[PDB]
Amino acid sequence: SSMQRRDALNSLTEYLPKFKWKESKEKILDIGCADGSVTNIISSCCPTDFELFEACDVNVKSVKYATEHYGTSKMRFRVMDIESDLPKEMKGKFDHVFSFYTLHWIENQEKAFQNIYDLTADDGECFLTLLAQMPVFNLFDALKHTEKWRHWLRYIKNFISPYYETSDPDVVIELLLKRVGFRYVDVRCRQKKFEFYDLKSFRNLLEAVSPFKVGQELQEELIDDVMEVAKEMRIIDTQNSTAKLIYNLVVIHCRK
């Protein structure tokens, strides 16, 4: 989505000058590559010629789309769960580990952050972004106790950020990262705005980010009901036919 690309670019632009490379032949990893369009931004923006850049994701079709489109001899897309046990091959392998708009998908929060630590090299650093409060969560959440969608949206909480209703998520995450072993930790809760100027660009977003598989017959009907709720919640201005999303993106910069 456009929202995810801007936040990726804005993040890298700011924190790029705070990273240390300190050598030649740098191995890099991105967690939750999806289509690989953001990974391309990370790979491209990074000044160095990385000997190897890996990018993982649990979604099989996404990895295939990515390997088919962005795959090179040094840009390898593999399947992997970051909640699962790491292979010994990757323990302490990566000079930089990246992960944007992914860690809010993940139940086993403590294993993920420990795996990210374990993945990072002795003198390595990590750069992670993830969603806290996001109105889109609330838009779908308002549909989970309705006859129409009650059963499709049963595993809703498995997709909503564990931090969307949390007090001082920055403090909770920072403590988690320090207890994991990271010698340097910096976690910020960044309030963001993203405006949509027509309703179609807002409907395009809701379609892209919908984790549900309601089919084709019901698929259009779901988004319509989400758009109606979005009018009631004032996330889309009915007078102007515009949409406004105000959300928190927690951005993390650690060093082993």
Place this chain on the structure above:
Amino acid sequence: SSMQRRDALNSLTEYLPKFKWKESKEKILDIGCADGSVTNIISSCCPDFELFEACDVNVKSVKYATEHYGTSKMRFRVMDIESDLPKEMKGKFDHVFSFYTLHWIENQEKAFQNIYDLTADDGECFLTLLAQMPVFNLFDALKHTEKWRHWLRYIKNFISPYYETSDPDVVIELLLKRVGFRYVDVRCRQKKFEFYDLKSFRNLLEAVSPFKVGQELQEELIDDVMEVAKEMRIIDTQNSTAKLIYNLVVIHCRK
């Protein structure tokens, strides 16, 4: 408001051990004293303090506050931080505190410049500020309505400048460093406050409502704000509960 009491206590409890204290005869100031419940918390919490000044723009609030929390050390007066500083308070205060105040203020740059000027040579500041807050959106949904269109004319004077801002922490930080603050730590703190009944949520909206619409209209106004809250999913119609998820920006500076 119970929401402001908690945030104040949580904010002080965390940052108290990070403050630097002078040996004796310290001058302290709290901006936006309001009723003085929070100012009494600030005073009661921190370690024989020589002086405790408080201020406000509301003349009735300071009069209320003086009678109930007035002492020889803790004096209250009227002062607009957006105005020109009285020269007697330049570099006078070793600690300056302001909670749930600086979002009320239009001239954002003079307010912070005045705070810096209020602060002593090696003094520090601890400020809290609202960014995004649903209560802002609740009233904002009544501004184009013909019923309230004239009453909520000056809505934007009371809504936080940072309520729709990208990276308010980066904006506020840059502003504070440019003022001349040597150390600046500004966090955007996501918060949750839960109301278990509609009465206690209704009570907040009444307390925090900045509109003098009068006895025959306030109730009718609150009712209409409560209905918008149902539509915006801030109150759960089923449980008869309410949920506020908002951003409090907390600021720790050294001059």
